[PDB]
């Protein structure tokens, strides 16, 4: 088949900037390119196809280009409603095949990430069961660390990580971090701690509870 | 105006089959071909196959011969794809969208229909109060949390005070642990609103029909 690759999966700019999206074929496919936006809602749209022709109703800041096997798709001052991830898709030959995707984001400032934790709520301790909960809210850029201490000693299994996608608004990232355990296994232990390691301090930010202080 | 109304997201167990379905509308039917893509964020997008929809002939993409079936209701522009012997490989979103020939572009896409393969069994969520620990907040702002545990499938809704407090709000996507899903939700406010005002994480699972307001209270 026709390999389509999109050599950079995550490309971050700021807003108004000239934004261009490389695509490359395995093989000769003409022009026959084909580029399309998809979005959190589920939502896909074409925006250029033919390798350079704009879809009815795509604006005029979107523009193609290429031929043969290198091909790329530019956006030239980069808008709020393009954060968004693009694909390209070659048609000159069966089976039809689409590149991995390019997932835009912006830049900003380097935040450090605000913590929080949570011990079990006392309804999920009569049902039986304890998780833990870390909260690392509205840092950047997106790479971070998260350790959980029980007593003392590192505890990596039960402990699972969510990231969301980056903020709308202030342009931030957010990490939820669940430490599960049985509630005999909690109540077995005294000193719970999640430490958030980030580029933003060469020391960790640590918050600490004593299970019932 | 062309329109691709696609059927109502799926949950079915391994090894079953599943069919679904795409209304087209807003242009002539017949002189389209119909197509389907996979969406799957382990392989990105994936071209199914399309249907000629005036004589049913189909043309696949060789790796989902035997997986998919197409077909075609053209009185009622209507167009139908099964799934067979399903496996959790076969979780995904799948897309109808139209082309003139396969050399032009997929100019309109449905909204897309989520699949879900599983052995998990339909279950509401836990929804647990997250409060500060007994002795913050320390500072100007302070954080509460809402912990959805334990529900199958995916999705649930989370609100807070009905979607009345929408700033300051991070919902973390959920994920599998033992084999339910678990989902949190942050809220941050000036510690001159709670809690002297009251704050509620509204949950919602429509595949249990079922609905959670749970206030967040200052811990004993």
Redesign the interface.
Known sequence: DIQMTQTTSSLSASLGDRVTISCRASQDISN?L?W?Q?KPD?????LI??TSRL?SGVPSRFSGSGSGTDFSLTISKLEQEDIATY?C?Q??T????????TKLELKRAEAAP?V?????????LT?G?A?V?C?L?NFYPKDINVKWKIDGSERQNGV?????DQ?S?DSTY???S?L?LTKDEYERHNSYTCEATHKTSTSPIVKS?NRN? | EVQLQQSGPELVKPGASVKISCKASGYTFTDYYMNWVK?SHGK????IGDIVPNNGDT?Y???FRGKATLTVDKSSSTAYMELRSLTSEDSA?Y?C?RFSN????????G??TTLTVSSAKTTAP?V??????C??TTGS?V?L?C?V?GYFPEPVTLTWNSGSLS?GV??????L?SDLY???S?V?VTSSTWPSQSITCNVAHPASSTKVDKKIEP??
Not at chain 1, 42 to 46: A, D, R
Not at chain 2, 170 to 175: G, L
């Open positions: 026959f084909n399309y998809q589920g939502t896909v749209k074409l196809y033919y879809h694909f898709q048609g000159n069966l089976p039809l095949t689409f590149g991995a995707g605000t929080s934790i949570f011990p079990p709520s006392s309804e999920q049902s069961g998780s909960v909260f809210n699972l990580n969510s990231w969301t903020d608004k957010s990490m939820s669940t599960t509870f202080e | 969406l990105s997008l994936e071209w043309t993409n060789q790796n979103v897309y969208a396969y050399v032009y572009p997929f100019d309109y896409w909204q897309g836990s647990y109060p997250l409060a500060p620990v002795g913050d702002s954080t949390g912990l545990k700033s991070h919902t973390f996507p959920a994920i642990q678990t989902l949190s942050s941050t811990r004993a």
